[PDB]
Amino acid sequence: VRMNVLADALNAINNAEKRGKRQVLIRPASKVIVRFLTVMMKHGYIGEFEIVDDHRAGKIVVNLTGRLNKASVISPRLNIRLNDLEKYTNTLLPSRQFGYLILTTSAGIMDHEEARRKHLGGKILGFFF
Amino acid sequence: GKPKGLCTARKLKTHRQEQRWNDKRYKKAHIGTRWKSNPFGGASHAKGIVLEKIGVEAKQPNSAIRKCVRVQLIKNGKKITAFVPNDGCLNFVEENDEVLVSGFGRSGHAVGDIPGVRFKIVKVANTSLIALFKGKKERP
Amino acid sequence: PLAVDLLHPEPQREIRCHKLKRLVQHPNSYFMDVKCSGCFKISTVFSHATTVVVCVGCNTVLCQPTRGKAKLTEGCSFRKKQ
Amino acid sequence: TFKRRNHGRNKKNRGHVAFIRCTNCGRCCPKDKAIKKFVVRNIVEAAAVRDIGDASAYTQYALPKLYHKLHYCIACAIHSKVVRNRSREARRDRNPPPR
Amino acid sequence: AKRTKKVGIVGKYGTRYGASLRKMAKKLEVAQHSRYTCSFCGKEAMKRKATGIWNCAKCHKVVAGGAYVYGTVTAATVRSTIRRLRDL
Amino acid sequence: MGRMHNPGKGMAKSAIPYRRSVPSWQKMTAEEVQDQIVKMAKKGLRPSQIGVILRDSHGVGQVRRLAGNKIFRILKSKGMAPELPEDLYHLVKKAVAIRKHLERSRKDIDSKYRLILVESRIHRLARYYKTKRQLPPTWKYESGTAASLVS
RNA sequence: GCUGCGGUUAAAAAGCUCGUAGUUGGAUCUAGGUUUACCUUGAAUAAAUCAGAGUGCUCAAUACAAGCGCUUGCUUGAAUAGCAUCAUGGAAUAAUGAAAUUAAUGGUUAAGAGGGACAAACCGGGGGCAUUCGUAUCAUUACGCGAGAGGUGAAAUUCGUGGACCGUAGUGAGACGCCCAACAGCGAAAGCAUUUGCCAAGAAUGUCUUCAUUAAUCAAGAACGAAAGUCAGAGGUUCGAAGGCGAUUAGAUACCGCCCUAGUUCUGACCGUAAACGAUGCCAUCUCGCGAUUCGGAGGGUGCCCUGCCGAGGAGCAUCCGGAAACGAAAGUCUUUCGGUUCCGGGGGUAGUAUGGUUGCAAAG
RNA sequence: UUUUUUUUUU
């Protein structure tokens, strides 16, 4: 039974990136997936993507730029306080010079740098680098 | 795989406790019969009375007769076998002597080629065995 | 190949792809108006019909259910309704 | 150490396969595991076909044949040299040997 | 409440005659004191009168059956054989 | 078909068209189709068969698209809902048939296994319908009375 | 080992399935140009200790002091940091509720989730009950034969002129379904194979049919579960534990041969264990090429052939990555660890032993 | 056809 569309999507992206493919198809698309991909694109780790509509959950087609090392989900969505954000980033990200921790906060889905700028905690969604 | 849900704290904690008992160290330190089984009753040393002097054949490939002594502990009256270290030190130990006994070093396990001996002598007649061996002190 | 247009698949591949695994699902079935020699009444029928569809007036069997597409009675033709 | 990928049998999609009794030993061996040999021979050895023909009571008689399907357990097959051990690489070859 | 755990009807025998003998008697005692569906009126009203005699309380039919069961397996197979021969 | 108690990873299902509009050639009216559905319900057919007949003969691809409502909803509004939902009714009927078969053949261990699975499905479906208030809260599947209930 | 271990072979996947608690659960409602849960900020929150600011106790551990003028004096430090409750703001994520005189009157979609329906010269050693047939083994009858037959490495025990063994033709019993028969099929697993009839069930495929989250895994709980074994009743052909003989041997309580008892078979109950093995738990998802094979479908040619055809199986050889390696298209997508969930392991023994509990007629589980 | 053994340490 499927229980994490984001986990499936990120696994598919990772596999396609490893194989060196130029496009990847993501099944059950969702708002969370779209926001995650938007953050990745804004930081330049993927190209453009299209949301194919089929009167159902829909699909996505993402253009891979051959620049992403790993995009992983963190389950369960543990609550991250602004005080332990530093510990979580040090643990999960390869370096302090690159890589992003994606959180969902009351403001919205963003990366850990923007969350620290706005002094927001929240539940962790995943990370990419 | 282990549970990963956000509300599985009870399962994780209970499973950890259940499996800690399959750990030799944890079980040895929490079984409950430690005091009644350990001859020293959880102490480091114990005073006892020498009953006889015995010789223990060293394990293979070594060959020798280790000079041990049978002791009865005062605190509980349990019988143990203790090693008399150093050379010719069995002479200092007479029968019906009050000896201080300590562990052999491996926390209740045999040491070296001596089989089944887990204790050694530290003092005889309130005198240090090392002092007697070195000649610092003499038999009371 | 690494570079494949997942957005615009080749029409022949889309035809020779499973109905569910296409980019957007589309059934391989269709509705057909059937003409039977005789009464010459056009009758709409589902391609994969599992019921014996019967002429309203002339009471002649038009299709026979099968494992896949329904089998049309001999002498009856069909045309795909748009 | 696992010697063979098929574990010495030919059992796939199956739980249980009935056994056969070997030809020599009589041991029970699963039918997929037993070494099977279909043998078609002349009813009379090659050295006596001429004698039988020259003694034939008919102008033209077709000499019949013996058909035997033989099942061997691994032990009685190796001993009889119906099958032989192979190198590690040659073990994976599945084509029948030349006859 | 369940009065007896396992003895059931043979609880009348107390501790006598041996466990295995009482166990053997239990099956047949239950069977002979049970009520069976009549094949004529269709109601569960067949009761044993004497060994081999089964009377229906409703339709008043008397049938020759088993000693402790309304019908026996051998009689059933014989009936099946006769019916099969009749059909073919 | 899917897998509930069996190891079947089937991939055969209807693929509804992307088009949500009635075809131009489709001239049956939204009210006429409702009348046809009520007529078939009078005759005694259930929604699964009503839809099949409408698709095979009358050319109605999706009654939801044409009439704007699901067949069971139409029957409910017209006050023709059955006592038992269709799937529950069929499961109960299957259980009754398997039992009747086992009364005769008591060595059919496979039939015993199938009965166990069917009754487990019955109980789960009944729980769901009781949650949705489609069954009386005290409704319970009784082996003895199930035959009359489903007949 | 939550972060963060391992379970094919090193210890470790329950035989298999159903199932309550528990855990976990698809997508979807203002993008643009009522409740909770959670996060932020405050409030309430003894010292000593820990961290930490200041300060030449001669340094330090400490301590909480002290430093300046000039006398009648001034100024000081003894900081700051360190579940539940209340309040504030935030409205993503995750749960939860609303409707079966006017107004657009009020039902999200129909999951490459799940269930149910409908189709089929459908598919199958799937299951059950009856039934038909076949040689063979054994016994026995009739007829012929004439002295060996059987068995082994060689023999012997054994059978044989009361005429065996061998032939031909019958008769009877019980067991078993050869060849076809396969890297074939079905079943949850255990397992399943002579013909036919009946009974209920099911897979896959087809589907513009229906319901609409009904789902995954599952402590306790429950069904099934090879062989042997136990109880009762029938059968007792073959083979055959135990037993008895003949060999072999130093011995031979064995291997070999002969005669056999329980058993092997049927019916109704027990037991619940196997190297019950793929020594690999289940559900979902992604990653490679090739040509074969079983079932169904689509499109053509003449049951067969073709379609680099579509699904679903069961495999094999071109195999990224992985692995201690053997090897694995999963045992890969894991220090770049993190989809959900159940069970299990923690150096070797003692030991699956003792004791207690429970199940069983016992054996034992 | 038969074919059992090979003290301790190094």
CA distance linking residue C70 with residue C50, whole number of Å: 7
Contact criterion met (CB < 8 Å) for A52 and C5: no
**B47: how many CB neighbours lie within 10 A of its CB?**
14
A-B interface: how many C-beta pairs under 8 angstroms? Answer: 6
Strands B119-124 and B79-83: parallel
Does residue F20 belong to the interface with chain A, where contact is any CB pair within 8 Å? Answer: yes
Q: Which nucleotide is nearest, taking the CA of residue B62 and each C1'?
A: H9
Cβ(B121)–Cβ(B84) below 8 Å:
yes
∠ CA(B11), CA(B12), CA(B13), 5° rounding?
A: 95
Query: Gap positions in chain D, given as the residue before each gap (C–N > 2.5 A)?
Result: none
Residues of chain A contacting C24 with CB distance shorter than 8 Å: 52-54
Strand H–CB B62 distance below 7 A:
no
Nearest residue (CA) to C1' of G11: B22
- Mind giving me the DSSP string for D17-76? --EEE-SSS--EEETTTSEEEEEEEESS-GGGHHHHHHT-SSSS----EEEEEEEE-HHH
Grouping H, G, I as helix, E, B as strand and the rest as coil, residue B59 is coil
Give the distance, in angstroms, between residue D45 CA and nucleotide G163 C1'.
37
**Preceding omega of B61 cis (within 30 degrees of 0):** yes
| Contact across the interface for A54 and F18, Cβ inside 8 Å | yes
Q: Can you tell me the distance from the alpha carbon of B96 to that of B98, in angstroms, rounded to the nearest whole number? A: 7
Q: Around Cβ D88, how many Cβ atoms within 10 Å?
A: 7
Which residue in B120, B103, B108, B114 sits closest to B29, CA to CA?
B108
What's the token pair of residue D74? 């691994």
Would you say D37 and D72 are in contact if contact means Cβ atoms under 8 Å apart? yes
Q: Which residue has the tokens 């079984």?
A: B31
Strand H nucleotides, any atom under 7 Å from protein beta carbons: they are: 8-10
Å between CA of E79 and C1' of G124: 35
For residues D53 and D57, what is the distance between their CA atoms, to the nearest angstrom? 9
Please state whether the peptide bond connecting residue C9 to the residue before it is cis, i.e. omega within 30 degrees of 0.
no
Nearest to E43 by CA among E63, E64, E53, E57: E57
Contact call for B and E: 3+ CB–CB distances under 8 Å: no
Other Cβ atoms within 10 Å of B99 Cβ, number? 23
Distance D79 CA to G236 C1' (A): 39
Expressed in Å, this structure's resolution amounts to: 2.6
DSSP state of B90: G
Say if residues D62 and D49 touch (Cβ distance below 8 Å).
Answer: no
Contacts 24+ apart (CB under 8 A), A11-19: A13/A46, A13/A62, A13/A64, A13/A68, A13/A71, A14/A68, A14/A70, A14/A71, A14/A72, A16/A64, A17/A64, A17/A66, A17/A68, A19/C2
Structural contact between residues F65 and F55, judged by C-beta atoms closer than 8 angstroms: no
B121 alpha-carbon distance from chain centroid: 11
Rounded-to-integer distance, Cα B20 and Cα B34, Å: 17
| Structure determination method | cryo-EM
